[model samples]
Target: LPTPDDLMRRFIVKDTLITIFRRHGAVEAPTATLYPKSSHYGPNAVHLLDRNGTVLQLPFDLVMGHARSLARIASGPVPQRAYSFGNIFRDRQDGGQPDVYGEVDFDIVTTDAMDLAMKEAEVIKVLDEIIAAFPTTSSTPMCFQLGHSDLLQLIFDFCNVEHGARQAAAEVLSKLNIRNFTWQKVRSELRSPLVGISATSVDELQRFDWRDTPTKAFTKIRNLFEGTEYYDKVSSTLAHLKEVYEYSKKFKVNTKIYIAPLSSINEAFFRGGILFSCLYDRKVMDVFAAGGRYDGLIKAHRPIGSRFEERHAVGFSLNWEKQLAKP
Candidate 1:
C-alpha cells in the first residue's frame, strides 16, 4: 500500500544507514520475525497463537535481540560491530492486531577492559556519522538528549525512594514530556495511596527536565545536590556527565548533545549507564533513536552467572516507526 516515493525514501534511508554502518566495520546481522513466548514478555509484548496452538509473540522490536546478539558473541574473538535493519512489530492497545514498523539498529560489544572514555566516544561517533548523513535544518533540527541511569538512581536516592520503588519511580520519570504525562499526574499516581511511598520523594522528580544545554543542566544538577548528603555519591557521576559532553566535542561529534541530568532511555532502567534519546523537534516531537550501555540486557541472555557474563555494550536504534521515510 505504499507509493513509489515512500518505498524509495525508505530504501534510501536503509541503504544510507547500512553503508555508514559498513564503513564503521559493522556486519549485517538480520533478525528473525518470530520470537518464542517466554516469561520475559512484558506488558507491551504482543502475543499470537501458532498454527499448532503454541503461544508465541511477534518480534515487536529488534532492539532486544540486537543486544541478545551481543550475548551470542560475547566470548567470540571477532566482529566488534553488527547491524540490523528490520520490520519491528508494535503491540496495539484495546487488543487490536499489531502493526509492523521499521527500525534501524546498530550495536557494539566490548570487553570491560577497553578504555572507558574512548569506548563511549567511538560508539557515539558512529552515530554522529549516521546523523550527519541526514541534513538537519534550523526548523527541523535534531539533538540527542544524553543521560546516565546512575544519575536517575542518584536522584531517586536523594529523594529517598526505596529499592522496591526505584524502578517504578524511574519509569514515571522517563515518561516526562510525553503525552498526558505531568509531574502532578505522576505525583498523584505515586503518592501514599500506594503504601509508605513518600510524596516528598517525587518532588525532585519535577526538577528533572530538558530545558537547557548540557553544561547548564549539569551545573544546575550539581547545585541542586551540592550540599546534600548524596553529593559525594553523585559528584563523580556529574563529572562523568560533563566528561562525556567534553569528549563528544573533543571527538568531533557535531550534533547538539544536551546532557539532561535526569533524562533516561525508555524502559532503560534494566540496561543503561550512558543513555540518550535522539529528538527531532516537530509539531509533536519524535524520539527517533535511543540506547546506551546494555550490560544488563546481554547478561539476561547469557547463561546464569556464566564466565562470559561480564561484557559491556552500547548501541542505539532509530525508531522511525510513527511516520514513514522523512529525511
Candidate 2:
C-alpha cells in the first residue's frame, strides 16, 4: 500500500541517518554481501549456491556477525566506532515476498560498563532524532522499554533451585506474552509446591488477596536467596538496571522508558546491560534499535593468538524497512 512518495521518504530517512552518523565519527563500512553457513547464527539467513556450487548464505542484517567482521578487519586495535547501511536478506513465512530490508547499524567498541550505560541513552536519543525527522510519515508517539537479560536469568536460576519448580516457572513465564501481566496471575499460574502456597476451594481462592502479591512474592523469593551467590548476581543486575534508568532520565525526549523484568528477544546473545524495544501506538512494530553491553560477543569472535582482545562493545541498529513500513 506504500505509494512512491512513501517509498522515497525511506531513502530520505536513510540519508539523514548517514549524515548523523558521519557527524558522530561513524565511518561507513562495506555491506556484507555473503556469509558462510558456519557464521549464520539464527534461522533467518537465505542460502544459495555459488558458481562452484558451494553453499553460501546472505546476512540477515548488517549487524549480523559484526563482531566477527570487526575481528577480520582489525589490523591493529579494533576501531571504536563504525556504521553500515544496506539491504539485507532473510527468510519470511508470509509467502508474499522474501524478507529483503535495509538497515543502518552503528557499533561502539568498549568494555567499560559505565560507557555502555551511557551508550544506551545515546542510542535512544539517535532513534528519537530519526523519528522526529519523519514528521509527515511517522506521527505516532514513541516509547522505549528496557530489559535486563541478567535479571531474567537470575529469576530462572531461582526457579531452578527448587525441584519441579523450574519447568513450572518456565512454562508460566513462556506463556506470559502480555507485558503488563499481573503478579497474582504469575503466582497463580506457577502454583509451585516449592513456594508452599495453594488454594483449594473456590471460597479459599476468593479470599486470597491479589493486592501486592507480586511484590510480596518477589521479596520472599529474593530474601530466600539473600547472602548467597545467586542473590549477589541479582543485586548486581538490579543495580545495573537502576544505573541505566537514571542515565535514561537525562535524555531530553518524550520517549517513555520502562523496566521490563521478564522481557527477552534473543536468549543466546545480549548478556547484560540495557535491552531496548521501541514502540509506536503501544504496539511493538519493530525493534527500531537495540544494543547493550555485549562483552561475551567480542570474546567469542576473537581469533586465536590475536593479541588485540577487547570485550567492551555496545551498539544498536535501526531497521529502515520496518520503520518505513505502512502503519
Candidate 3:
C-alpha cells in the first residue's frame, strides 16, 4: 500500500465521482497526452528534462491534453461526452501550489450548434450532483458564481481597456471574487494609463451585484448598461445567463446560484459563459470547481493529420484534495 489509509480514502472519493459522472451519461475514457503544443498550457505545466536534454511536460490539464483526439471524435455524427479521473500536475506557486493533484474532470465536446446556455446549465447541474455525492461533503453546500464572457467582453470594450491589456484587466477583476469588492481598491491597476482604459468607463462596475438571484441581477443589469452601446449585448448576455439559471433549476439542482458579473474566470480560452463554485458558508473564499465554454481549444490544437470542423467544448474540473479539506 502506498500509505496505510491514503489509498482507500482516495479510492472512495474517486469512486463517488466516477459513479456520479456515469449517472450523468459521461463515459469514462483516457484523457490525451504526449507533449502537446506549448500553447495548450503555460506557466503551470510541470516540466522535466528528456533523455536527450529536451523539455518534457506532464499532461497539465485533462481538456487541453485530449483536445486533438476529442475534437476528431466529436466531429462525428454523435456528441462526445467523457469523464476522466486521474492525476494532473501543475507548477503553480501562488500560495496554492501542488506538485500534483488528483482530479476528476469532465468534458462535453461536439461540433453541433447546441444552445450554449442550456449546455452550461447541464454542466453545472452535474457538478452539483458530484458535490452532493462527495465522501467528505461540506455541510454548508456548494454555491455557484455564474458569469458571461459576452458581457465581460462588452465591459472591456466599453472601458476601452485596449486589445492587449484585456487579460491583465480580467485578472484584476478576479479579485472581486474574494469579498466586498469596491471600485477604489482595483481602480489604480484597472484604470492605469499603462493598462489603458476610458477614464469614466468603469463607473458601472461598482454597481454589479454578486449575491443577487438571476432575475433581480438582470433587472439591475438592464439599468446598469441602459444607455451605452453595450446595452444590447449586455442585455442579451444577461438574458442568456438568466435562461441558463432557469434551466439549471429545471434539473432540480439544489446548489444556490448567483450572478456575478465581475467573476474571476478570466482565462482567455473561455468563450460564451463561465462558472465557479465555493463552499456556501465559506469563512474565506476557496473556489474549487470552474468551467466554461472553449469553442477555440480544439481548433488551436488540431492534429495535423485530422480534418474536422472546429468543435465547441465545455466542462469543469474539481480538485479532490480541496473538496475533502478545509481552506
Candidate 4:
C-alpha cells in the first residue's frame, strides 16, 4: 500500500512533469467535464444524477473529453500544443478491489500530423524521465511497442473487396490467439460459399495471383486491389509503418522497441502510428502507457456550430497507480 508520503511523492513527480511540459510550450488546461452520450473507449460511462434530477455520464479519461475542451476555448487560432493533469475516473469490474479508481492522468495534444510525429519522441522522453524519478527498487523496466491503425484499415478494406472472406477472416483473426496462431487453424476456420476456392493462410491471400487465378473469388479480390484506391491506402500505410520504425531507432530511446503491423489498439481513434509502453518482465503484461495519432478526433468531437477544419492530435496517459503498484 502507498503511504501518505508515497502519494505526495507521486504528486511531486506529476508537478515536475507539468512544469517541464509548460516549459516546452504546453498550455496547461483545467480538468474538462464529462456528459452522457459522450463516446469513450470504455464499455459505458459512469452516470450520476444532478440536483435537477437530470442524469449525466462522467468522462472516463482526459483524452476522451479533450475535443470538447478545445471547442469551448476556441477564440482565435487553435493552440498547437496543450496539456492537462487531473484525476480521471473509470469503473473496474475485474473483481479485485475498488469498483472505481481515479487515475492521475496527463495528456499532450498537437494539431497536425507533422507536429504529432515530431512530438512522439518528446512524449517518450518525458515518460522516461518520469520512470527514472521513481524509487529504483520499485520501478520496473519498460519498453515501447509501435503499431499503426492504417494497417488495420487496409486489412478491413482488403477483406471487404471479397464476399464471405471478410466474415471468415474476421472470425479467424479475432478468435485465434496470436501466440500460437497457425496457417492450418486459419485455413480450417475460413469458409466460402463459392466452390473450389480456399486460402491456406494470410501469405496465400497476400500473394494470390490474379493472372491464372484458381477461382473467380480470387479474381474479384485481385481486381478490387490492383491499381485501386484501396491498394493505394495499403501502400501508404506500409510507408507510414516504416517511418514510425525509423523514428523509434533515430531517437535512440532508452527502452526496447517493437513493431506490431496488425496491432488493433485504439483502432477507432488512432489514425496513424500507435505507441504502447509495458513492463519488460513478461509476467503481468499490462500496458503502462498508450498514445497515438488521432488526426480526425478533434474534428469529430467539434462543437455543432464550429467550423470544420483539419486538426491532428497525439497524446498519451500514464496509469500512475499501475506503474507505482508493488510487484
Give all TM-scores, in the order shown: 0.77, 0.64, 0.75, 0.59
> What residue runs in model 4 are displaced by over 4 Å at the alpha carbon?
19-27, 33-79, 89-115, 136-139, 157-232, 272-284, 304-306, 325-327
lDDT tens digits, residue span 216-324, model 2: 4345446656877876667666666556566666867456665555555442345554566565534433345555555664565455775654557666656666666
lDDT of 4 by residue, 254-322 (tens): 665654434444444454445443334343344556666655545554547756566555666554555
- What lDDT score belongs to each candidate, Candidate 1 first? 0.61, 0.52, 0.61, 0.47
The ten-residue window of minimal lDDT in model 2 covers 202-211
Between 1 and 3, whose TM-score is larger? 1
Q: Candidates sorted by TM-score, descending order?
A: 1, 3, 2, 4
In order of listing, the candidates' clash counts read: 0, 2, 0, 0
TM-score leader: 1
Which ten residues in a row are the worst by lDDT in model 3? Answer: 46-55
Q: Write the per-residue lDDT of candidate 1 for residues 152-188, one digit (tens) a residue.
A: 7787777777887765555666666656565566677
What tens-digit string does per-residue lDDT give for candidate 3 at 120-215?
788888888877875445456567887777777776676555667777677777766456444565777777876665556566455563557788
Model 4 lDDT vs. the true structure?
A: 0.47
Flag the better candidate by lDDT, 1 or 4: 1
Error of 1 at 275 (Å): 0.9
